[model samples]
Target: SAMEDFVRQCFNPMIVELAEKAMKEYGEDPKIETNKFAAICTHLEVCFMYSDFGKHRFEIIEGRDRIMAWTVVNSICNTTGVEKPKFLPDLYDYKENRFIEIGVTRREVHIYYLEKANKIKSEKTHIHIFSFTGEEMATKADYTLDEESRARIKTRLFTIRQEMASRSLWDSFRQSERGE
Candidate 1:
């Protein structure tokens, strides 16, 4: 329960703040998305952070033990008939930049990524999370790596964010993490 408290009270806010700072530093639009989810969370163990780019959205679903991020790489824009950026490839490309950087893409993450890429703005896609039966979950991805792998990607992405935050936000993040 204390760990849950730590996550809820400290980590959640910290991650959101850090993500927003990092996004702005990344040359994203000055208006980056933040916590546009949940009125009140009852589950102490779960939390989420998302960044809504006008076209593609970046999301991270986190738990006490694990965290993962995915970007809605592409979407069909109804008004202009222009497809969003294909930054994240579908079809299990081993060499895809994101996959190579992240080390693995759970089949479900792959599925969700592809689904959003193809979805029309107004149509909703059905997603379920009966993990035991494998019917519905955020991701039942093709490949999942261990904490070490997760850490690898985390470090890589953090470096990218730091580069974006060259002005000092990255150091500011370190200070936050240090409880400064």
Candidate 2:
């Protein structure tokens, strides 16, 4: 409950503010996708700080949004300064006799990057594997991390880090955490 409250009252507002900032600078366009996503991760890192995963696993279903899943994980790696794990775990559902790899994909991220080079704005593809007798699953994907998006995300993060260095927001957060 405390973690949920923190994400809702604290982190959510910061994301809204970051998105607004990006819109102000980049116009109201999907071009700000990266900025919005990067902003989400910036605050997520902070949220993770207050959270101990071993104690509780934070599951934001939004994090599983297929296309943005990579974005979310990548942003975390960027903020935490870590490399992508060599292998991600796959859940084997005994009842279903199948594997579930949630929020796992590198090839799609690479495809998104290639879209920028090709300059193709055609239809986007999403993956879905489900069957009755076997197993059923649905995934959501919405966003393309083309080169421009990467550039936009990189710039936003850089600017955010610089601003963070200038004046630590943690001071105010710490005070707020103290609670009256």
Candidate 3:
């Protein structure tokens, strides 16, 4: 499994090393504890590659198309590496189910210095929870609901679409900058 190998060998190790370095540099304050550093490491690992798991989970809970859409959203994050810009999560509640579906946006805050040597710009990113929902098909483009659902979906999709477009622009910029 390429994804498994990637998680174990590349993603996890890289995240651990990065966390160690970050902790050494930033964990001196009493408020900045080991747990906080671990959380930072986990956030980086999850944001970098959680789409596969998220999509699979969504597919199992809902439908393939729904997860496909989520994968599309995640694709934007994957390509941009959190640098371009992103949105916040949209939370919602549906009477049909008792669970919540949350939307998250990943934003890059810092670049990986070590990766610069390898010509790979790894960004320190954060995921913002823009919205939450309890409906299975709550992601419809024009699904009608209360003002809250409407507003959340509207803004969430808007930001997601914008990020997707920006990912394309950033790709072009990176390629041009690298002379590729």
lDDT of 2 by residue, 61-150 (tens): 132334454565455456655444322212222222222232211123334234322442222212222111122223343222234533
Model 3: lDDT to the true structure? 0.32
Q: Estimate each model's TM-score.
A: 0.23, 0.23, 0.25
Mark the regions of model 1 whose C-alpha exceeds 4 Å error after superposition.
1-8, 12-14, 22-34, 37-114, 117-141, 146-180
What's the number of clashes in each of the models? 10, 0, 13
Give the best candidate by TM-score. 3
In order, what is each prediction's RMSD in angstroms?
A: 15.3, 18.2, 18.0
**Which pairs, if any, clash in model 2?**
none
Off by over 4 Å in 3: 1-11, 27-32, 50-127, 130-180
Which residue ranges in model 2 land beyond 4 Å of their true spot? 1-144, 168-180
Can you give the lDDT of residue 12 in candidate 3?
54
Estimate, for each residue in 154-179, the C-alpha lDDT of model 3 and write its tens digit.
45334433443444432322222121
